[model samples]
Target: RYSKISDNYSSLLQVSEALGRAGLESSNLIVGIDFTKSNEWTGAKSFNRKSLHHLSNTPNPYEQAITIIGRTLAAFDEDNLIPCYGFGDASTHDQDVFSFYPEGRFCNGFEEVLARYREIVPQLKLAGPTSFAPIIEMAMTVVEQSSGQYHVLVIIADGQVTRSVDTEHGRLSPQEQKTVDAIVKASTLPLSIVLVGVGDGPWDMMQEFDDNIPARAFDNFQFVNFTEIMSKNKDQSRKETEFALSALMEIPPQYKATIELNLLGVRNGNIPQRIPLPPPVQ
Candidate 1:
């Protein structure tokens, strides 16, 4: 007599259901802009502010990226309120890690964020060491507090991870590595990080993160080079559309697992908290 073979069927069904729920669940957007010296190739150009070299009273690459990506993501969000922050400025104080526009709170939508970016780019100076840990930490904290909403962090940078103590090497230093370790641990939550390189800079580190390097764990990050996606060959609109779709294609599955785990926690009367280990020695 032959036995019935229905193995893996239940597992596949669960994943399918989870994907459906993930798409239906509400999410939030957290935007972080890099304001480090590395972003700006030149010094103190009144017209050309920061990394925005194509300043002709029009939306630069960074601005265009924000609009396109943010607008696409806003559709998935419930309220479309985006919390924006800038890092790596001239200030070294702890309070200056993540600065917001109009003092505090988030913007109404992508349009509001675009307007604010144009208004402040010329006035604000970009001069500080690149450190992504603070903003990452802040985003995680916000995601943890919200019960029904997930978060997706979008970091727009023009350069690789740099440090104050060391010279520019176009790689993640000891401190930056530590930040990556934390990010890996936190990837289990209902959150995903998308790094968009707006300018023509080395994006090896960004790709490394996406490839699950070093720690060899967590696959919740995706990095896209703006230059590659905005090539002059094909139709610009089609390229952008394709890039956006691919960047966010992995979210549904991640969101599904996050929600499933949270539901399990509620059923058990306590959420599961994993103790994170320290980073590897460099």
Candidate 2:
């Protein structure tokens, strides 16, 4: 996700720094390519000073954004924490999945991983306005191959889905809903999704996507739109970064305990885990 409000490279750095600070790591971070033709469609006839300013440089935000994210994830490769995965361009057609960092190699190192990102950026081209569900379905394949450990998916996008929503003109009502259905139906093992909205493009469908606030079992997911913070300038960006870090830091404790219980196969009588908050001073 990129705009004048938030630069993709900087946001990637922020997320990477936070992930590094925390001991948390992921096996892969998958990105979807939504609009491959936005730039070409830009009415240059309407070019103004700002348009000229944008034209002065490379004008491709997605490419730069993916590069930064890939490099950041690759930074962890040296330590063997988690390797990044890149997927895009397939949605333009019948849905294809591409791999940036293949699993099982134990990545060479951070710089080497970053180098792979740099190598790919120049070659990446906007292919289509694709659907995200197929990419997600493909991710399930990766999870299935996992060695019985827990796994989670974090998706960051501008929130524009190209799938079908059950509504008039297919404005994304049933389309988004169907994708959610697919995710729910396909998981043989436990799965969770953390959705972060990078921009405004009508993510109301996300309510249907998660519905249950902190969802249950396989349906667990959270949606947050950064419009308020992202609308402002760099100061806002910093604030959003702080909030993301805090939330990311907080959510995992509960998750870790749940995983521990699952590992022990402890599914029986309730465990006393809650404590009452102290009463306020009179």
Candidate 3:
């Protein structure tokens, strides 16, 4: 038993060393907060705040998802800056896709992002049909502009693909299919999309998205169900930690592979001749 425990510890240490030696220094974290009607917590007359269902005062799945995953990803970034965005609103005049904290640029750091979320999340009205197309498109643009930086777009949504409140006009569920196609196209880039379903809504739709039934683009996607992750675990913090760590563990390897492939192309089939190979982490 003791030997087994020691072996597990050694293996973990080896993995940590390997991750460090791979030169996976940092990544850009883009957060897409779902500001749709489904995410709003409408209940009895709760705490007197700006909005009756203010995320800061009430128990909010979106807020929980953001804080847990946001902090975890931030720890890997060299600058810790996170670009937070909000999408899906019914209002036509208001900007559906806009910055969450609105620092005019990326938030100073992950801590600041969390702090700003608590302060400003309540003021903004959450009333719109959920559509991932806008945010995914936005992420694509950002990833294109970022040039050489690897990006992970974290979307905290309630697993519903409603076009509008009363407009069912599509042949193939246009918005949903469009989002999926975008994800497939994004597979080739230095990007990964993490969709965290944050509510008790029928998550089959989300499951389908994760499965990528028709087009298996790449394995650079992960979908974490918040309810399931929290239900079986007693310690909420540890559960969050475990989920965050597991969801993010694949990024380093993916990044390493992408970089090596790019290097192979850039070096004209002589990567080994130009750059020294990374030492084995054992």
The candidate that achieves the highest lDDT relative to the unseen native structure: 1
Off by over 4 Å in 3: 1-23, 41-53, 56-59, 91-96, 101-104, 163-171, 213-217, 260-282
In angstroms, the error of model 3 at 108 is 1.4
| Lowest lDDT block of 10, candidate 2 | 272-281
* RMSD of each candidate relative to the true structure: 10.7, 12.8, 10.4
Task: Give one digit per residue, the lDDT tens place, for model 3 in 1-282.
Answer: 222222333333333344456555577888877766655442222222223225544445556666666655554678777777766544311224666543336777766766666765545556665666566656666666555477888887765665433444534556666666667665656677777766565676666556653553346677766656655534554566555555566767777765765621121221111111111111
Model 3 residue 220 CA deviation in Å = 2.3
When 1 and 2 are scored with TM-score, the better candidate is: 1
lDDT preference between candidates 2 and 3, better one = 3
RMSD of 3: 10.4
Ranking by TM-score: 1, 3, 2
Per-residue C-alpha lDDT of model 1 across residues 152-250, encoded as one tens digit per residue: 888877766554354365554755675676477456456678777766566656655555544423356777776566653655555565455545656
Q: In model 3, what are the clashing residue pairs, if there are any?
A: none
